[PDB]
Each structure stands twice: as C-alpha cells, then as structure tokens.
Design a protein around this ligand. Structure first.
Ligand SMILES: COc1ccc2nc(/C=C/c3cnc(N(C)C)s3)oc2c1
Ligand SMILES: COc1ccc2nc(/C=C/c3cnc(N(C)C)s3)oc2c1
Lengths: 61, 61, 61, 61, 61, 61
C-alpha cells in the first residue's frame, strides 16, 4: 500500500560500445525463422510474457 | 505493505565494450530456428515468462 | 510487510570487455534449433519461468 | 630503386571500443605540464622526431 | 634495390576493448610533468626519435 | 638488394581486452615526472631511439 522508488532502474542498458568489422554476412532461410544481430535492447513487461530474440520454427495444428 | 527502494537495479546491463572482427559469417536455415548475436540485453518480466534468446524447433499437434 | 532496499542489484551484468577475432563462422541448421553468441545478458522474472539461451528440438503431440 | 607496397599499414589504429564511466575527474596544474586522455592515436613521421603524449617540465637556459 | 611488401604491418594496434569504471581520478602537478591515460596508440618514425608517453622533469642549463 | 615481406608484423598489438574497476586513483607530483596508464601501444623506429613510457627526473647542466 506504499511504493517509494528512487533511482530505481529496471531493464536498463547503458554505456555500450560496439565495433563490428566484417567482410561478408549472409543469411539463407527456407521456411523457418532466423533472428540475428540484437544489441543493446531493454524492456519491461507487466502482466504478460516478454521475449527478446525468440525464433519459432512453425506451429502446425 | 511498504516497499522502499533506493538505487535498486534489476536486469541491468551497463559498461560493455565489444569488438568483433570477422571475415565471413554465414547462417543456413532449413525449416527450424536459428538465434545468433544477442549482446547487452536486459529485461524484467512480472507475472509472465521471459526468454531472451530462445530457439524452438517446431510444435506439431 | 516492510521491504527496505539500498543499492540492491539483481540480475546485473556490468564491466564486460570482449574481443572476438574469427576468420569464418558458419551455422547450418536443418529442422532443429541453434542458439549461438549470447553475451552480457541480464534479466529478472517474477512469477514465471525465465530461460536465457534455450534451444528446444521440437514438441510433437 | 623499386618500392612495391600492397596493403602496407604503418602507424594504424583500428577497431577500438572504449567505455569510460567516471564520477569525478580533476586535474590541478601549477607551472608544469599535464597530458591526460590520449586514445586511438596514430601517426607516421619521416625525417623528424615524433612524440605522441609527451610532457616536458620546463627548459631554462 | 628492391622492396616488395605485402600485408606488412608496422606499429599497428587493432582489436582493443577497454572498460574503465572509476569513481574518482585526481592528478595534482606542481612544476614537473605528468602523463596519464595513453591507450591504443601506434606510430612509426623514420630517421628520428620516437617517444610515446614520455615525461621529462625539467632541463636546466 | 632484395627484400620480400609477406604478412610481416613488427611492433604490433592486437586482440587486447581490459577491464579496470577502481574506486580512487590519485597522483601527486612535485617537480619530477610521473608516467601512468599506458596500454596497447605499438611503435617502430628506424634510425633513432624509441622510448615508450619513459620518465626522466631532471637534467641539470
Ligand atoms: C516475494 O514475492 C516477490 C518476488 C519478487 C519480487 N520482486 C519485487 C520488486 C518489487 C519492486 C521493484 N521496484 C519497486 N519500486 C521502485 C516501487 S517495487 O517484488 C517481489 C516480490
Ligand atoms: C637495414 O636498414 C633498415 C632498417 C629498418 C627498416 N624498415 C624498413 C621498412 C621499409 C618499408 C616499409 N614499407 C615499404 N613500402 C610499402 C614501400 S618499404 O626498411 C628498413 C631498413
């Protein structure tokens, strides 16, 4: 019945330095799922499911 | 009945330095799932499931 | 009935330095799951399951 | 009498990632020299002296 | 009388990752020399002297 | 009378990862020399003297 927050961080990404030197980068997909290259990602979910870099093949029913 | 937070971090990523020198990077997918390259990712889930880099093959019913 | 936090860290990643020099990096998937390359990842889940780099083959019913 | 170069690097800096989180940074100088904070610096000198981060006190004659 | 170079590196710095978390950083100089914080520095000198992070007190004549 | 180089490295620094967590860092100089904090430094000198992190007190004549 009382929430007191002060400088409360939750799901926070800060101070990132990235260097990516590459000569080739191919991705060949045939009927599935490919996730690639997620970086410096932050989220907060209340009352629900939270997926960041989620690959699902296929759902057949 | 009383929550007092002060500089409370939860699911926090900070101060990351990354260098990735590569000459080739291929990914060949055929009908499944591929997750690759997740970095400096932070999240917080309340009342739910949280997956960061989750690959699922296929769900057949 | 009383929660007092002060500089309470939970699921925190900080101060990471990474260098990855590679000449080739292939991944060939055929109908399964492949997770690769998770780094500096932090999360917190309340009232739910939390998987970071989870690969599942396939769920047949 | 014949110079053949090919992809010849000399005094080269590449692919640097830096993160510097600091709360205070003071420098107090009284009549001398202070050099601070040189990063990712490259040079090439022909027929002469080359100093990168050089502090000299004082030259009295 | 014949110089053949191919992918010849000389004084080269590459692929550096640095993280420096500090709370305080003071430097107090009184009439001398202070050099601090040189990182990822590369040079090449021909026919001359080369100093990278050189501190000299004072030259009295 | 014939120099054939191929992938010849000389004075090369690569693939360095550094983390430096410090709470305080003071340097107090009075009329001398202080060198501190040299990292991932590379050079090549031809026909001359080369000093990397050299501190000299004072030269009186
Ligand atoms: C025992 O049951 C549990 C389990 C996990 C929990 N995690 C929390 C976080 C609560 C807060 C975070 N920031 C708040 N502000 C700034 C108002 S409140 O509470 C939990 C209770
Ligand atoms: C024995 O005397 C010495 C000593 C050190 C030397 N360092 C060299 C470098 C020569 C070159 C570098 N890149 C060149 N291209 C691409 C034309 S030529 O020659 C030296 C001779």
């Amino acid at each position: 019945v009382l929430y007191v927050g002060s400088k409360t961080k939750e799901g926070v990404v800060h101070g990132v330095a990235t260097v990516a030197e590459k000569t080739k980068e191919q991705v060949t997909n045939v009927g599935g799922a490919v996730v690639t290259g997620v970086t410096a990602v932050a989220q907060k979910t209340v009352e629900g499911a939270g997926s960041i870099a989620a690959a699902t093949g296929f759902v057949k029913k």
